[PDB]
């Protein structure tokens, strides 16, 4: 808080990168069969303990705590799929160069997982999100700031209980972006173009993200008939966000409009 400490203590940018998760490995069990079965029950046992860090993560994100706990509730379980895929894709990117999917060290799927999963569509929706992380060369400092605007991109239809909160700390990030394709404007050429690619880039996740809860919300609804297991921080997730979605209490929040 003192005046110097303020000046020169690491920009916010910096600070995302110092909260970033660590790794999460799946537990993959080599006894049992590549079947969606295992691979479904599988990703999930791995989503659930990414969840509890994206929890601990978004505790100590800048801003957050200035929002009502039931908005900060609200947001991450909105949110869950898109913050998920989001690091999938820069994981597959950093570690694969977007060939393969890498869920975490031992659970990366290729084309014949992808099959198995009975997800091999939305796979390679995701797949095709991580190519253009190659094509931009998306860098760490945009990946930390999109993650965050990821958080905040998705509301109840009806918006949240402090709306100016959320919409104040939306808009900080935003221009956190901005400054930082000012500065770096990457291989989009001008700085315009680059934030452009990058939100547009954010907005497709929109559609697939939908796609991906549909399936999940279906292997839920039907997890003991379809032997589809869910750790506990996904139950409480999907029972709560899942019957939101379905009747139609979600906003998402486009950078431009369709
Ligand atoms: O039972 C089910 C079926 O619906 C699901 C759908 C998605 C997931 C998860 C993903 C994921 C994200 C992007 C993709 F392209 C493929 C993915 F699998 C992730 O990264 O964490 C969980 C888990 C289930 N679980």
Redesign the pocket.
């Known amino acids: 808080l003192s005046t110097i400490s303020r000046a020169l203590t690491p920009s916010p940018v910096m600070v995302l990168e110092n909260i970033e998760p660590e790794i999460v490995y799946a537990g993959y069990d080599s006894s049992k069969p590549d079947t969606a079965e295992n691979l479904?029950?599988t990703?999930?046992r791995?989503?659930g303990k990414?969840m509890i860090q994206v929890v601990k993560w978004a505790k100590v994100l800048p801003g957050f705590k200035n929002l009502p706990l039931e908005d900060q509730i609200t947001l991450i379980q909105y949110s869950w799929?898109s913050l998920?895929?989001f690091?999938?894709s820069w994981r597959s990117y950093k570690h694969t160069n977007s060939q393969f999917?890498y869920?975490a060290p031992d659970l990366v799927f290729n084309e014949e997982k992808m099959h198995q999963?009975?997800?091999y569509e939305?796979?390679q929706?995701?797949?095709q999100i991580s190519l253009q992380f190659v094509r931009l060369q998306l860098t760490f400092e945009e990946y930390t700031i999109m993650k965050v605007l990821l958080l905040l991109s998705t509301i109840p239809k009806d918006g949240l209980k402090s709306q100016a909160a959320f919409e104040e700390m939306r808009t900080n990030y935003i221009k956190e972006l901005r400054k930082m394709v000012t500065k770096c404007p990457n291989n989009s050429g001008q700085s315009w173009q680059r934030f452009y690619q990058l939100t547009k880039l954010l907005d497709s996740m929109h559609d697939?993200?939908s796609d991906?809860?549909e399936?999940?919300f279906?292997?839920?609804r039907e997890?003991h008939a379809l032997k589809?297991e869910?750790p506990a921080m996904?139950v409480e997730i999907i029972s709560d966000q899942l019957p939101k979605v379905e009747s139609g209490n979600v906003k998402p929040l486009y950078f431009h409009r369709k």
């Open positions: 479904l029950s990703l999930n791995l989503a990414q799929m998920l895929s690091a999938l999917l869920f999963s009975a997800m939305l796979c929706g995701m797949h697939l993200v991906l809860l399936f999940c279906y292997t839920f997890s589809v869910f996904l």
